Structure formats: structure tokens, C-alpha cells
Structure 1
Amino acid sequence: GNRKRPVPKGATYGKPTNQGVNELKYQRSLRATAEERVGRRAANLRVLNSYWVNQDSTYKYFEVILVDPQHKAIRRDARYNWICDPVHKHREARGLTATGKKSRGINKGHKFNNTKAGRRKTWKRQNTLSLWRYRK
């Protein structure tokens, strides 16, 4: 379901464009918050991927694949030892998994001009004022 806005008694204290409480939607996916809770449960592991298995009216069910970056079978085996690099701590928390990149909008094309190298990065890049030594 949706994300109810956590305000006491529905009062938002602002302009009427921000008075919505009920029909607001979370920007990340249920798959994303599922693997993020799994990563917090096993912080010594690394989240690789996730997949849907089942659902009902109340819950959605996912299975999360995790890899141990301290086990010697992953310290060796050069196909997988890239996960032991410290830049991959909490990929699911930084949105670097498959559904994380899907929710961040990282794709090539004219349909992704807002979100292609990072939405906030592009916003800073096109809201920066660039002044040179010899003013153009």
C-alpha cells in the first residue's frame, strides 16, 4: 500500500497543495525497503539482488541474495571478489542494486534527462553559475 504521511491528526501547517495525507506514494520500491531491512539484519553481508516470490493483500514477499565478503571462497574467485571492495558497503542503502537504479531512474535516453548521472548532480550542474578569469 501507500505511505501515510506521519503527521499528528492530518494537520500539515502549510499551503493547500501540501495538505495531502492519504494518497501519497513512497518513491522507493517494496523490494528496495525489503532488501534494506535484510541488510540491516545482516550488516556483515552484502546485498546482491532480490526477487519476488509471493504476495497477498497485506504483504509482498521477496527473497534476497547476499554474499559474505569475509569468506575465503569470495575473497578468492576473481569473478566475485569485487564485492569485497569497501565502496560496495550498503549498495541497497545507496540505491546501487537493480531496483535501486530503477527507482533512481538511471538509464540512457531522452526519457531520463532529469535522472541520468544523478538527479541532484544534474540539478547542481545546471544551477551552477560559472565565471571565468576573462569574463565571457
Structure 2
Amino acid sequence: EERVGRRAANLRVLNSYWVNQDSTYKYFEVILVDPQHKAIRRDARYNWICDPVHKHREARGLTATGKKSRGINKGHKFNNTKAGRRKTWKRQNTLSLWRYRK
């Protein structure tokens, strides 16, 4: 997903799926949306990808497989990585001191 993100830097990685596999190589077929295309910039179901908060979703693991590998879900089992493991580490490792000391 990241490699196709760099060769096609004008696009935005939406999703990807498995197509064929082998001893040496696993293949995928990434799906990409052109946020600069006017057939995407209209139609209010897909123009969310034009918002600059989606510039390289695949580089920050915001795709389906990235959210899997980050371990982002709901429950007991994902407590260490539910808001992101870096965020929760920094939060729980903070000596919080009030004006009137608790």
C-alpha cells in the first residue's frame, strides 16, 4: 500500500485486497481515488477523500490493514492500543499535578 502510495502520489489509497499468492511473492490490488478529479470532488459520498486529512492514509496506517496492524478496535484485549499505543503510553506515563495537590 505504501509503495503504490509513492508511485501514484496524486491519488489517495482507499483500500486493498489479496489477489494471488506464491512461495516468494504475495500480490495485492490496491484501489485508488483521484481527489483532484471533478467526478470525485462533487458527489457527496466520496468527496471526503479530498479533505487534506487523508493525504497518505496508507503511510499512517489509516487503511483497513493498517488499523489491524496498529491493533485498533474495541475491548479489554486492545486496552494497550485503542487510542493508539503511543498516545496511551504517553498519557499513563504522566505525573499529573494539580494546583491544589491531590
- Tell me, yes or no, whether TM beats 0.5: yes
Aligned to 2:56: 90
- Rounded to whole Å, the distance in 2 between the matches of 1:72 and 1:120 is 38
Give the secondary-structure state (helix, strand or coil) at the position aligned to 1:130.
Answer: coil
Structure 1: 4+ residue segments shifted above 6 A: none
**TM-score normalised according to structure 2 size:** 0.99
- 1:31-89 deviation line (CA, Å, top 9, x unaligned): xxxx1000100000000000000011000000000000000000000000000000000
What's the Cα RMSD here? 0.4
Alignment gaps of 5+ in structure 2: none
Q: Report the number of matched residues.
A: 102
Identity %: 100
After TM superposition, give the deviation of residue 122 of structure 1 in Å.
Answer: 0.2
Task: Name which one, 1 or 2, has greater alpha-carbon Rg.
Answer: 1
TM-aligned CA deviation for residue 109 of structure 1:
0.5
Q: In structure 1, list runs of 5 or more residues that go unmatched.
A: 1-34
Higher relative contact order (Cα pairs below 8 Å, separated by 6+ residues): 2
Q: What is the TM-score normalised by the length of structure 1?
A: 0.74
Aligned to 1:47: 13
